[PDB]
């Protein structure tokens, strides 16, 4: 037997957890790894330490058949440790199933770790509130068993099908919101079914890591020392969440920049409606596609620390660098935040949201309200705020 650890994600959150797993297994330079990522590519100083390290292209929603060529290199009996994105598991998994069929005697799936894409999974669960969950589970267990025998992808409820891997394999689930599964009454049959097999995405894993392993982790994910230091201070920290443009009545990027400069001031200036107070050090986390908009805000905002595009909120979480407060333009990252860390979330107009009432109906917003991660006073439509 040779164990092969296989990491697959096209999004970014799973990738970041999967790399944390790799960091913990980091001493082991022997076991073969296949890295099937869309975003992250790994430093040569790290990869060249590992003598059985392979990389596979993720085209569409799945690994390419390059993965067949990679596994052809290992003619031993093989046991695969799969790590997968929860929402896209079936699609990510299928090429591995195909390959197993070609070598049915010689290759097996030792285990699965499954990780939340993001808010997608929850938005999706929310669409199933009216179903018979207890019966849907038994159905999927059966359909999954057919699927592994045949290769035929046929599930009556694809969404719930994501959570029934334990009928086939040793499995472990990593959730953004363990509270959702606990408080959603309709899901109690699923909660009960998954007991023992899930845990909350760990922001503390990083502090547990030995100094050596942490440095290992920051290298993997792109976190420079220079930018790591920006968070060294013991001063409490507020982060403004930037955006690009929205359905203002104009194409002029500099309009949207100025407006956000206004929104920022509502947080930072004592005259602001949303004044957070003088305790916080102010950071800017601009959209990666921000460009000249981000240039503009950094130019006109005083006393503000910029955070580079490469440093997502997800990385901050995974390194225990969540700040004491977050506020600004509405995005689904807020789903991931603890309730104590959310000042105000501001919705800009697009085609679904034209007003606060619409904002209150955005799928991820509604669940956050039910879980009480925010109150309606924290939802603000951008139009309602004056000019300073």
UniProtKB/TrEMBL annotation:
GO molecular function: glycosyltransferase activity
InterPro entries reported in the protein's UniProt record: PM0188, Sialyltransferase_N
Residue ranges of the TM segments: none
Keywords: Coiled coil, Glycosyltransferase, Transferase
Keyword Glycosyltransferase: yes
Top-level division of the source organism's lineage: Bacteria
Coiled coil: 123-150
Protein name: Sialyltransferase
Organism of derivation: Pasteurella dagmatis
């Amino acid at each position: 037997s040779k164990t092969i650890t296989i990491y697959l994600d096209h999004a970014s959150l799973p990738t970041l957890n999967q790399l944390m797993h790799f960091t913990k297994e980091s001493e082991d330079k022997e076991t073969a790894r296949i890295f099937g990522f869309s975003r992250f590519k790994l430093p040569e100083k790290i990869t060249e330490q590992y003598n059985n390290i392979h990389f596979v292209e993720i085209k569409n929603n799945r690994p390419t058949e390059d993965i067949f060529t990679i596994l052809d290199q290992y003619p031993e009996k093989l046991e695969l440790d799969l790590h997968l994105n929860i929402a896209h598991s079936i699609q990510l998994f299928h090429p591995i199933l195909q390959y197993r069929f070609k070598h049915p005697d010689r290759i097996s799936i030792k285990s699965l770790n499954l990780y939340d894409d993001g808010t997608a999974e929850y938005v999706d669960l929310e669409k199933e509130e009216n179903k018979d969950i207890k019966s849907a589970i038994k159905k999927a267990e059966k359909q999954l068993s057919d699927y592994l025998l045949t290769g035929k992808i046929n599930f009556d409820n694809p969404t719930l099908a994501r959570y029934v891997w334990q009928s086939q394999y040793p499995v472990k689930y990593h959730f953004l919101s363990t509270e959702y599964f606990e408080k959603a009454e309709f899901l109690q049959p699923l909660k009960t079914y998954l007991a023992g097999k899930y845990q909350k995405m760990d922001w503390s894993a990083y502090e547990k890591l030995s100094p050596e392993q942490q440095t290992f982790y920051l290298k993997l994910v792109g976190f420079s020392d220079e930018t790591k230091q920006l968070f060294h201070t013991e001063q409490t920290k507020f982060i403004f969440t930037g955006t690009t443009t929205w359905e203002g009545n104009t194409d002029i990027r500099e309009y949207y920049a100025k407006q956000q400069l206004n929104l920022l001031k509502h947080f930072t200036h004592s005259e602001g409606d949303l004044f957070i107070g003088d305790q916080y050090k102010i950071y800017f986390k601009g959209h990666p596609r921000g460009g000249d908009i981000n240039d503009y805000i950094l130019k006109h905002a005083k006393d503000i620390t910029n955070i580079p595009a490469n440093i997502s909120f997800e990385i901050l979480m995974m390194t225990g660098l969540l700040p004491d407060k977050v506020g600004g333009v509405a995005s689904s990252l807020y789903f991931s935040l603890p309730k104590e860390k959310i000042s105000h979330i501001i919705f800009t107009s697009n085609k679904k949201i034209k007003n606060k009432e619409d904002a209150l109906n955005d799928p991820y917003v509604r669940v956050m309200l039910r879980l009480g991660m925010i109150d309606k006073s924290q939802i603000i439509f951008w139009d309602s705020l004056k000019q300073l």
